[PDB]
Amino acid sequence: VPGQEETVKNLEIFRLKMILRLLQISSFNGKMNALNEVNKVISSVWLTAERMAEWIQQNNILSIVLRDSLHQPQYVEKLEKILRFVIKEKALTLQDLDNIWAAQAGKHEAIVKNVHDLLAKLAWDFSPEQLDHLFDCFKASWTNASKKQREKLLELIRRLAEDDKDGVMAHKVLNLLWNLAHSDDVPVDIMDLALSAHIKILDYSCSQDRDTQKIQWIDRFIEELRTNDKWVIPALKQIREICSLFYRHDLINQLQHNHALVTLVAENLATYMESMRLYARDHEDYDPHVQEVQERLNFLRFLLKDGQLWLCAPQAKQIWKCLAENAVYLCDREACFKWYSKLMGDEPDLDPDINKDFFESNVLQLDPSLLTENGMKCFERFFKAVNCREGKLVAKRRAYMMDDLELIGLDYLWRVVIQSNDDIASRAIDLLKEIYTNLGPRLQVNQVVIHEDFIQSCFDRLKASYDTLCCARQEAVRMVRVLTVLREYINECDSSLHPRYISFLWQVADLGSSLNMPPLRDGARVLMKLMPPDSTTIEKLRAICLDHAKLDSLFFGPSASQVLYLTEVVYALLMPSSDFQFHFLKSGGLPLVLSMLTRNNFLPNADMETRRGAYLNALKIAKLLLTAIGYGYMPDICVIRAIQKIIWASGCGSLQLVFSPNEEITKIYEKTNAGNEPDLEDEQVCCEALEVMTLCFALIPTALDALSKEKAWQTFIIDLLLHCHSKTVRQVAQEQFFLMCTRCCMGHRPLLFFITLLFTVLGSTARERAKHSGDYFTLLRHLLNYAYNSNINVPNAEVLLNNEIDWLKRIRDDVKRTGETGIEETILEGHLGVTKELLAFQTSEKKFHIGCEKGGANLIKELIDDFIFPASNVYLQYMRIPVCGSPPTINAGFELLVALAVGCVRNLKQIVDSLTEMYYIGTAITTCEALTEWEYLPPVGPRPPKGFVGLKNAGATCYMNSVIQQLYMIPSIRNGILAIEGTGKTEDRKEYNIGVLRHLQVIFGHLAASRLQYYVPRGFWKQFRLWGEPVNLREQHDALEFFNSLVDSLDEALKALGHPAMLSKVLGGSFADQKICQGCPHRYECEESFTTLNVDIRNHQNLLDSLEQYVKGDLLEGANAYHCEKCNKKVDTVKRLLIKKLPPVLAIQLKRFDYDWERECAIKFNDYFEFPRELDMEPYTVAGVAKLEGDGSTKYRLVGVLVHSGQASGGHYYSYIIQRNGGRWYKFDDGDVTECKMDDDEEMKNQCFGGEYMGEVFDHMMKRMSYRRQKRWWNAYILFYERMQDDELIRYISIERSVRKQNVQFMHNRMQYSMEYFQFMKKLLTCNGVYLNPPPGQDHLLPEAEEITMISIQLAARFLFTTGFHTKKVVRGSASDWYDALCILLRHSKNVRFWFAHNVLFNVSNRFSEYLLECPSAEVRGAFAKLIVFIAHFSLQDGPCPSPFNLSLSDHLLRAVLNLLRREVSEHGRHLQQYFNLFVMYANLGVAEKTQLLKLSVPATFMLVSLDEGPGPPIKYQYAELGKLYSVVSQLIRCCNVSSRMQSSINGNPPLPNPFGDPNLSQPIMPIQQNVADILFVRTSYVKKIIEDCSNSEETVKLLRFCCWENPQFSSTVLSELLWQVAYSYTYELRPYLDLLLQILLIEDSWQTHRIHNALKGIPDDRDGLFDTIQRSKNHYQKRAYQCIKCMVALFSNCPVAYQILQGNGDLKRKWTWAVEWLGDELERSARMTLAKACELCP
């Protein structure tokens, strides 16, 4: 209705009222609809934009909306357009803006950032009053902002600036940024944050209003730091960052025209350094300074890199002389030196003129006493740059090579080296040596002048320093440094002439000991040594020696250090010079060297080292002097006393007490605070004096006899054997005491005296030391052995043996009582050795009354079952701690047992009986079995002591064993599981869980007490089934599934047995899933039990970030907002997971695996992840979050790292575990447990931290290099953390047999296959060897020898053919020795040989096959073959042996070996060498053996073999080496008569006798057998076989030479085959054929001419023969033609018969001429010599 107008406005106002009340409705949906309809009506807008603006203003619509709706981004997005509509007609006021800014006062972060992005989007349309009002509001917030508040305000400001479309508002934005970054009330973090904000605002907003003010803003910054109120550093880095991006190369010049930075910053540095120095005099009690000076320096450096500017002198002056030269803090000087180091690297920046100015002006003017390491490199580069510009040095490759001598800098570099500390002096010395030693062109001809001038000037400086001494201490350092200069200078010279040079240095070294300066003497002596001997001294000594031959003052000069040097040069002359010895001995040599040692006034003012060196040199001289005079008297007793006192003093490290009354030296020997250890140079003095004493006693024997009665020469030996140190000295002393008593004694009394002396210190001093007795016992053993072997009778032997026996019994009683020896290992080994050596001095009635006697002390029994085999006795008891633990002690016990067994059959019998019943009674009762493995060791391992027990891997079982290791290593688990007693379809699952617990108990006990290296889990693999389905041992699976199944099964087993869930309590945790809503105060909490902690790995880099992700949780918003069951609406909710209960042990999983749908397979992620050793879980727990928001330890230590290495489908698992010890990490992989070096962080990064790295790849035989990015596919998978035997886990709520058995079996088997056991076996078998010889007038063994042989052969057979030869080479040890022992036993006895054959070779029916063919060891097969040959040889004289299925044992052995040829030989190729080698050896023995082989038709059967057609199948291995077969055939055939097949080529002439039969054979064994002739001469297969295959052999040529003699048919066949081989064969194997043909052509029988005719020409009209092959090979394959020509040259030059054939047949001469002409032409285009000899035979 047109007349209804006011009602239209009334209804519009009512609609406004209803909408406003709808906004007032607390329901968000009502406010949602009201906001939507407000947006709708505003967009459609009698209603203009003014009236809605007012209505919003007075009603404060925004105020109601802003109070709650700001928590949702969509509400802000909707309100944005309403705010824009309000603003665009100037309706928003400051109070409304204040309310907008009041929204961030104490509100949540989401609301604050919502307000911020709203303001950022609205800032474009705000009026200037609104914006600057917002700006001082920002400043007011800045006044009270927190740390996060300040950074979010900066983010808001950057949002505002980025959205600035027109660069007008950014002016005030940057003004505020400058105000904030230059306000000192705000910490340094917000400083750099605001600076970065400013820089990024100026960088990428360059669309408009950024350029052309860059200069304006940078000039504003320059003017800002042009005044000094601490604006300098921030403005400086501002300008530095602006110039980093913002044309730049000419920009520096533009800012150099009128606003120079380098100069202005130079004045800044100067006027600020002086400002600090103003208060540095009174306020010095503070600390550095560094932060600002380094920043300004780095500004200068970055600015002066690419601007192409030259640093002028004035600013260089003002920044060098005023900055560091006159400074306060030493760090400023460091900064300046690092500056002048970096500035001039490889390129000048100050121009050569200015450098040559300032370096000489003030850099060299600096006092070297104040200069540091950076100064060294800067000063070096200053030299190099300055000197290489003037034209004095050349850079060359690296070293700045010298071309001048008058340096401008060396004048004060000497001042630097003379006045500095150690490091600066070392650098200066390096500079001087690298500048002086290397001389190049234009000066390379002047070595002598420069070196001499340097040495002379430097020695003059040394003298100038020297004259001041007579302030003292530092000049010593001056001398040391200058002598270091000398020593280095000569060090680089090699890679003197002036006598004054050593004459001054003598006095220099003399002063070194005068005022007691160590380095002076050492440096002087080193310089003297590193020098050729002085020319004057050597000629003077030689002239004096010549004068006196046709000198005391020379070696007794009053200067101290010159005597030592003169002794050094003397020893240099003696030791290579051949003439000077005779001169030295003649004049005064021996007497003066000895009086050198026995006098008191040798060297009054002597140093601790001067006497040492002088002595040691005189001793080395006297050793060779006595060695020379040995072959052919001056030494006396006083010389011995002097040398012994010298050794007394030197063994104490107290050579200065070499004039002691000999009681004090004993006093410091007797454990005087352990401060008398001999040095590394007293050792040589002691040793050399020992050889001197030995040689002197060799000269004079009677002195040592007289020394025995003295109290000295008794304490001397005791001290040097027990009370001394430096084990090498003791070893030398014992060796040479033994040498003295062996050779120098010339009697038996000294041996008895030393033996008695050594035996009286056993219980007194040999036990007190207990560690130095290893050589005292060595002397005891050696002296006793020598006394036995030399038929010397020790007086008191039986009583000492009884004492040793009682001591051993006491030791065994101590071991039985406790389990540990009360002594050391050396004492036990030495006592066992002494008991062994004392055992030789008894008859056979003794050594049997000790061991094996009914009433004696049955020492064999206690030995066997208490020292060596207690474990074997335990094992024997089962089948119904050893005293000798260390391998040396076991060896000593073995030696004692052998010494008991030697010479006594009644002791060997019992030892053998015990050994058989303990090891070889199980199977070796009728036959000897085998291990079926031919290189056998116990495959279990030793289990090193400090290590642990691993677990066997079947190939894919790592994800069980690693988890089991990790679970066991937790002490609570290992204590709890083993303590659960009584463990030995619901019921089926209950029994399954019980079995799980029982198997875990068994494996835990095994790992706790097994002595093997690892364990192989039968029951573990048999019992467990994964999720019911059986576990496949060859199938890879995730370790997490197995861990979950195992922990669930163990918890079920514990619950079913009434025990608490220990695994759940220790490892399991519980998450507290919390849901907190933003629009309503409703909160939801629940508990979720878990066992392993899962952390994201792809999107996280460290464990801390992953754990903080749980605290942050996830936010549900929009369509994904959580629906509240109470409010019945969707609202934003923060879903976070917090740990409620903290387990003592925490398991954390790394989610490094996922699935790829494109690849249709599991994939592995190897992203770089981090985890610390110590973890603080408190911030991530419920308590920590509650404490932070404001409404039982929490720290954990990493102890176990499960690591995966390989593909996701496969891969390998292992562990890294900390062992809980009271005073570490270990490597747990499968059955191996080893130490690891992962404690370092770099190893942690390399091994388990994973990640990508820039790998280096080497390929193409180390000639190609490439860089490839590689991923660490080996990385950690689960992390175990331990918090910092619990009765609760054992308290109720609702077997050690297998370990012992397997330990005992392991010990028994390990003892069986020990190396020491094999040496013991060798000793036992080879002992009694001197008793096994027959009587001289008889050829059979006496009763005792026969019994010993029988017992030894029985035990040797059992041992060897059960486990001896099958053991691997390392332990079994060169079975040739076993063969030698078997030979020693077997010979000289017929019954023993028959027993061995019958019981070892003829009762298994497989011995020969397995030991000759099936054995994959050349040495074992060879030893067995040689043994068979031995037995066959020595059983020929024996009677007829019974047949083992008038035949001797040799016949049976040969038949048995030949029976292998029926089927066994043609199965075992690559192993046939030793079989036919056995046949070779047997023939070589003699004529009877050859006859025996021939009567067996061995040659015929052997010839058939290698041509198939044999007794059995052909050999399957086609590449069979049958050389020894051909050798046997050749040797056997050559011992036969072939005279039937001979023709002399002249009618009526008888054939010549054959010279090529077997030598050392009087007459042929028999006429050649028909079956042999049929294969040799009638048939041609064997000849071809041996020609084509048996090449280079010495037997094939012998056989062919023997058979071809006077045999036209055989010679024809051989020649045909040889010519075929010469023509049609490879040229690399033609030399053997040509050599064999040459040897055939040299047979000087009556067919030689025919053979030569048929070889040179060939078979007529067949184009074969040497000439035919030469003609064919002239064009191609010329090497064959050359080799044929060489063979013909040899034939013509070595055969007189085949030179008349050539000379006498014109056609052959023509062919030879053609051949030699071809060879000459080819060589014109060894060969040269062959061609030279070719036409010396030409006519």
Strands 1093-1096 and 1145-1151: what pairing?
parallel
d(CA 600, CA 983): 87
d(CA 1581, CA 1286): 88
Number of C-beta neighbours around residue 165 at 10 A: 9
Number of C-beta neighbours around residue 1218 at 10 A: 17
Alpha helices in 1464-1538 (DSSP H): 1473-1484, 1487-1495, 1498-1504, 1523-1534
d(CA 138, CA 150): 10
Number of C-beta neighbours around residue 1030 at 10 A: 10
Say whether 745 counts as a known binding-site residue. no
Strand partners of residue 1161: 1156
Residues 6 or more apart whose CB falls under 8 angstroms from that of 1574 comprise none
Residue of 545, 958, 1077, 1695 with catalytic role: 958
* Residue count of the chain: 1739
> Do 1382 and 1427 form a contact (C-beta atoms < 8 A)?
yes
Number of C-beta neighbours around residue 1269 at 10 A: 8
- Name the token pair of 84: 């824009």
- Name the token pair of 825: 């290992």
> If we measure between CA atoms, which residue out of 688, 786, 766 comes closest to residue 721?
766
d(CA 58, CA 1723): 122
- Name the token pair of 952: 């066997």
Strand partners of residue 1235: 1226
Active site annotation includes 249: no
Residues 6 or more apart whose CB falls under 8 angstroms from that of 171 comprise none
Strands 1225-1229 and 1093-1096: what pairing?
unpaired
d(CA 127, CA 92): 10
Q: Rg of the chain's alpha carbons, rounded to an integer?
A: 51
d(CA 1612, CA 1556): 18
Secondary structure (H, E, C), 952-975: CCCCCCHHHHHHHHHHHCCHHHHH
Amino acid at site 1474? Q
d(CA 945, CA 888): 18
d(CA 642, CA 650): 12
User: CA 672 from chain center: how many Å?
Assistant: 41
d(CA 1420, CA 280): 90
d(CA 318, CA 316): 6
> Do 1033 and 954 form a contact (C-beta atoms < 8 A)?
yes
- Name the token pair of 878: 């089962």
d(CA 1368, CA 1418): 12
CA dihedral 903, 905, 910, 912 (to 10 degrees): 80
First CA to last CA across the chain, in angstroms?
153
For the stretch 732-748, what's the b/e string if a residue is b when 16 or more beta carbons lie within 10 angstroms of its beta carbon? bbbbbbbbbbeebbeee
d(CA 1330, CA 1333): 6
> Do 1664 and 1623 form a contact (C-beta atoms < 8 A)?
yes
Strands 1225-1229 and 1232-1235: what pairing?
antiparallel
Burial of 24 (0-12, 13-18, 19+ CB in 10 A): exposed
Burial of 889 (0-12, 13-18, 19+ CB in 10 A): buried
User: What are the contacts of 718-722 at 24+ separation with CB within 8 A?
Assistant: 718/757, 718/761, 718/765, 719/648, 719/651, 719/666, 719/669, 720/647, 720/651, 720/686, 721/758, 721/772, 721/773, 721/775, 721/776, 721/779, 722/761, 722/765, 722/766, 722/768, 722/769, 722/772, 722/773, 722/776
d(CA 385, CA 1094): 62
> Do 883 and 832 form a contact (C-beta atoms < 8 A)?
no
Helix, strand or coil, per DSSP, at residue 1274: strand
Q: What are phi and psi of 1279, to 5 degrees?
A: -115, 130
d(CA 263, CA 669): 76
d(CA 398, CA 380): 13
Helix axes of 94-102 and 61-68: crossing angle, nearest 10 degrees: 10
Instruction: Tell me what percent of the chain is helix, strand and coil, each rounded to the nearest 5.
Output: 60, 5, 35
Number of C-beta neighbours around residue 792 at 10 A: 16
CATH number of 1069-1142+1145-1150+1161-1191+1199-1246+1270-1282: 3.90.70.10
Q: What are phi and psi of 1136, to 5 degrees?
A: -125, 150
d(CA 798, CA 850): 11
Active site annotation includes 1212: yes
> If we measure between CA atoms, which residue out of 376, 494, 479, 489 comes closest to residue 435?
489
Q: What are phi and psi of 394, to 5 degrees?
A: -125, 135
DSSP label of 1567: B
Strand partners of residue 1025: 1030
d(CA 1451, CA 1436): 9
For the stretch 428-458, what's the b/e string if a residue is b when 16 or more beta carbons lie within 10 angstroms of its beta carbon? bbebbbebbbebeeeeeeeeeeebeebbeeb
Q: What are phi and psi of 1176, to 5 degrees?
A: -110, 100
- Name the token pair of 1488: 């009877």
Helix, strand or coil, per DSSP, at residue 410: helix
> If we measure between CA atoms, which residue out of 779, 776, 782 comes closest to residue 762?
776
For the stretch 260-280, what's the b/e string if a residue is b when 16 or more beta carbons lie within 10 angstroms of its beta carbon? ebbeebbebbbebbeebeeeb
Residues 6 or more apart whose CB falls under 8 angstroms from that of 417 comprise 424, 425, 428, 429, 432, 481, 482, 485
Report resolution in angstroms: 3.1
> Do 1431 and 1486 form a contact (C-beta atoms < 8 A)?
no
Cα distances (angstroms) measured from residue 1309 to each of 160, 937, 1303:
84, 9, 10
> Do 1148 and 1095 form a contact (C-beta atoms < 8 A)?
yes
d(CA 1048, CA 1054): 10
Helix, strand or coil, per DSSP, at residue 1277: strand
> If we measure between CA atoms, which residue out of 913, 917, 905, 915 comes closest to residue 848?
905
Cα distances (angstroms) measured from residue 1143 to each of 671, 977, 1065:
56, 18, 7
DSSP string, 281-349: TTS-SS---HHHHHHHHHHHHHHTSSS-----HHHHHHHHIIIIIT-S-HHHHHHHHHHHHHHTTTS-S
Burial of 1258 (0-12, 13-18, 19+ CB in 10 A): exposed
> Do 1180 and 1139 form a contact (C-beta atoms < 8 A)?
yes
Cα distances (angstroms) measured from residue 1668 to each of 104, 1656, 1699, 1719, 1720:
113, 8, 20, 15, 19
> Do 758 and 783 form a contact (C-beta atoms < 8 A)?
yes
d(CA 1233, CA 1531): 59
Strand partners of residue 1195: 1176
> If we measure between CA atoms, which residue out of 1445, 1457, 1356, 1368 comes closest to residue 1413?
1457
Residue of 1212, 1308, 1388, 1433 with catalytic role: 1212
Strand partners of residue 402: 393
Say whether 1124 counts as a known binding-site residue. yes
Strand partners of residue 1226: 1217, 1235
- Name the token pair of 961: 């064993």
d(CA 998, CA 1005): 11
Helix, strand or coil, per DSSP, at residue 1123: strand
d(CA 1045, CA 1025): 9
Number of C-beta neighbours around residue 1627 at 10 A: 14
Burial of 1419 (0-12, 13-18, 19+ CB in 10 A): middle
d(CA 1644, CA 828): 75
d(CA 1471, CA 1553): 40
Domain boundaries, the chain: 7-103, 563-716, 953-1063, 1069-1142+1145-1150+1161-1191+1199-1246+1270-1282, 1608-1739
> Do 1457 and 1498 form a contact (C-beta atoms < 8 A)?
no
Burial of 1159 (0-12, 13-18, 19+ CB in 10 A): exposed
Cα distances (angstroms) measured from residue 1343 to each of 1333, 1335, 1387, 1435, 1665:
12, 11, 15, 20, 72
Residues 6 or more apart whose CB falls under 8 angstroms from that of 955 comprise 1033, 1034
d(CA 751, CA 753): 5
Cα distances (angstroms) measured from residue 603 to each of 192, 563, 656, 1187, 1497:
75, 9, 12, 83, 90
Q: What are phi and psi of 1737, to 5 degrees?
A: -90, -15
Burial of 1509 (0-12, 13-18, 19+ CB in 10 A): exposed
DSSP label of 1497: T
For the stretch 1440-1452, what's the b/e string if a residue is b when 16 or more beta carbons lie within 10 angstroms of its beta carbon? ebeebeeebbbbb
> Do 88 and 125 form a contact (C-beta atoms < 8 A)?
yes
Cα distances (angstroms) measured from residue 882 to each of 815, 864, 915:
8, 10, 17
DSSP string, 490-532: HHHHH---SHHHHHHHHHHHHHHHHTT-HHHHHHHHHHHHSSP
Burial of 560 (0-12, 13-18, 19+ CB in 10 A): buried
Residues 6 or more apart whose CB falls under 8 angstroms from that of 561 comprise 506, 509, 510, 512, 513, 521, 524, 525, 610
> Do 1279 and 1201 form a contact (C-beta atoms < 8 A)?
yes
Residues 6 or more apart whose CB falls under 8 angstroms from that of 555 comprise 563, 566, 567, 592, 596
> If we measure between CA atoms, which residue out of 628, 636, 629 comes closest to residue 594?
636
Say whether 1080 counts as a known binding-site residue. yes
